[PDB]
Write a protein that binds this ligand. Structure first.
Ligand code: A1ES3
Ligand code: A1ES3
Lengths: 291, 299
C-alpha cells in the first residue's frame, strides 16, 4: 500500500478534454494549485501542503501523464506534454472545480507548466511561485560543457524513442532513486520520507509513465523551447506578481527579472527538492507570499 | 566463435607498464599503428588493414581497456583512460616491437589518443591521420542546444558511476547495435560485416568493458578536455604532418568545417570529407584505404 501523506485531504479525479487529473484537495479559502515535477508526483508537497491548507483551499495535482493522472496519447510534436498544453489541461481541471482565478506554485516541470500558464493566460492567476527553476529558454541558452554535464537529462531523455525508454527499463528503481539522491544537498535519500520515495518508485516502475516523462523532455527540447523563444523575442514579461525560490546547492532572481515585471525571490539552503529538503523555509516563504 | 577478420595476420599480446595491448600484425615496410574507437575494437580496420599491409608493417591494436587489451584499474581522475595515458601506454607497446618513430592513424577515441600523442610526444610520429573527429576541446566548446541533442553520448556516459553502467547493463546488445547503426550514413547495420558486429557486441557484453568505455568518456569530459584546453590556450600546434578525414554525415562535421578546425591545431594539415557516416573505414573502405596509402607513402 502507498501511504496517505495528506491527512484530512480529499481525493478527486477531475475530468478534462485530455483525460483525468488526479488531485488531493484540502483546506478552505482562496484556491491554490500545486504542481510537482520530475521524477515525482503530487506527494512531493506533503510537507508543505498542510501549512498552506491553514489559509487556502490547496489542490495538489498530478501533472498530465504523471502519477495517477490519465496519459493522453502523444504525437510527433509531443503536443499533450508541452507546457502550453499541460497548462490548458490544468486550466480545464480548475474550471471543473469552479476556479477561474487562482494562486499557483510549481516545482521543476510543474514550475514550467506554471510560468507558461502565466505567459499564455495571466488572467487565470492571482500570484505565481516557481521553485528550483529558470525558464526552459534560459537553460538551453546557457548550454555549454558544464551545463550539458549537470543537466544531462535534458539531452538524454529528449533522444528519440525508444532509446531512453529502453535504457530506463532495465532497472528503473535504481535510476529513480539514484536520480532523486543526486539532486539533494545530502547526495542520498535522507531528505525524503521513505513513503514518498515509494510513491515515486512505483510511478517510475510503469513503462508507460516513463515514456510520458521522456515525452515531457522531448517537448522541453523542442516546442517548449520555441514557445519561450517567441516570448523572449517579443519582449513579453509575466505581469502576475511572482516569487522565485531556489535551493542554493541546486543569480536566478536576475534571470527571472528579465521574464517578469513583478518578481521577488530568494535562495534557501537546499538542493533541487526544496519542498522536501527545506519544508519549513519553503512553506514559510509561500505562505507569506500568497497571503 | 569470433571470426578472424585479418586472415594471414599474426597477433601479439604486448606487455606495458599499464597492461597488455592486443594487436593484429601484418605486412612489411614502414611501421603503421591503427587505433579504433567506441564502441568498437581493432576489428573495425579489417576492410582497410589488408590493403595497407601491401605497403606497411601494420599494427592493429586494441586501445587500453578495449577488446582483448588489459583493463587497468581506474581512479577518480580516470587516469588510465585519459588520452595522455593511453598514448604513453601505446608508445611503450610500440617500443617493445622496436618502433620508436612510426606512422599513426586513429578513428574516434583512437584518433583522440593519436592527436594527444602528437601533442605530447611529436618525435614519436612521422605522420598522423585522424578520422571522424575534432579535438575534444572543440567538441565541448561547440556545446549548445543543437549539439547537445545531436551528440548526447558524451554527457550521458560521463555521468558518475555507476549510473551509466547500470543503465547500459539491462540490455547491452540493444544499446551497442542501436549505437552502431545510428552513426552510419543509412542508419542501419548494413555497412558493417556481421562478423565485425559480433566482435563489438561480445566486447560490449562484458560489464568491465562497458565500465572502461564510461571511464574513457569521463576522461573525455574532464582531464582530456583540460589537457586540450592548455594546448589551445598556449597556441601549441601539432608539427607532425597530418591528414584529417571525416564522413560527411559523421560526427566531426556536425557543426564545423573540420579542416578549418584542424588548421587551428596543426601546422601542416590536409584533409577531405568522404561520403559516409561516422564509421569511415567500414562504410567507405576503399576510399579510406586509398587516402591513407597515399598520405603515408608521400614524402
Ligand atoms: C527538473 C530538473 C531535474 C532533473 C533531474 C533531477 C534529479 F535530481 F532527480 F536527477 C532533479 C531536477 C526539470 O527539468 O525541470
Ligand atoms: C566517438 C564518437 C561516436 C559516438 C557514438 C557513435 C555511435 F554511432 F556509435 F553512436 C559513433 C561515434 C568519439 O567520442 O570519439
Amino acid at each position: 500500500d502507498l501511504a496517505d501523506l495528506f491527512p484530512g485531504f480529499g481525493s478527486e479525479w477531475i475530468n478534462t478534454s485530455s483525460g483525468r487529473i488526479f488531485a488531493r484537495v484540502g483546506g478552505d479559502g482562496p484556491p491554490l494549485l500545486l504542481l510537482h515535477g520530475f521524477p515525482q508526483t503530487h506527494v512531493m508537497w506533503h510537507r508543505v501542503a498542510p501549512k498552506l491548507a491553514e489559509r487556502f483551499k490547496v489542490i495538489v495535482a498530478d501533472l498530465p501523464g504523471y502519477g495517477w493522472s490519465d496519459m493522453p496519447e502523444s504525437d510527433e510534436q509531443h503536443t499533450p506534454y508541452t507546457k502550453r498544453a499541460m497548462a490548458k489541461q490544468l486550466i480545464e481541471a480548475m474550471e471543473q472545480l469552479g476556479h477561474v482565478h487562482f494562486a499557483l506554485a510549481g516545482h521543476d516541470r510543474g514550475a514550467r507548466v506554471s510560468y507558461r500558464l502565466a505567459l499564455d493566460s495571466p488572467g487565470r492567476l492571482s500570484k505565481l511561485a516557481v521553485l528550483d527553476i529558470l525558464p526552459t529558454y534560459e537553460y538551453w541558452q546557457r548550454m555549454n560543457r558544464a551545463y550539458a554535464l549537470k543537466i544531462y537529462h535534458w539531452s538524454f531523455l529528449a533522444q528519440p524513442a525508444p532509446l531512453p525508454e529502453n535504457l530506463l527499463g532495465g532497472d528503473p528503481d535504481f535510476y529513480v532513486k539514484a536520480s532523486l539522491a543526486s539532486g539533494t544537498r545530502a547526495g542520498d535519500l535522507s531528505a525524503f520520507d521513505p513513503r514518498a520515495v515509494e510513491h515515486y518508485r512505483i510511478a517510475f516502475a510503469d513503462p508507460m509513465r516513463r515514456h510520458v516523462m521522456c515525452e515531457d523532455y522531448r517537448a522541453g527540447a523542442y516546442a517548449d523551447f520555441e514557445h519561450d523563444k517567441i516570448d523572449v523575442e517579443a519582449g513579453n514579461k509575466i505581469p502576475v506578481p511572482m516569487l522565485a525560490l531556489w535551493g542554493a546547492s541546486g543569480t536566478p532572481l536576475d534571470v527571472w527579472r528579465k521574464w517578469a515585471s513583478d518578481v521577488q525571490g530568494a535562495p534557501i539552503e537546499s538542493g533541487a527538492f526544496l519542498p522536501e529538503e527545506a519544508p519549513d523555509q519553503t512553506a514559510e516563504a509561500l505562505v507569506r507570499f500568497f497571503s
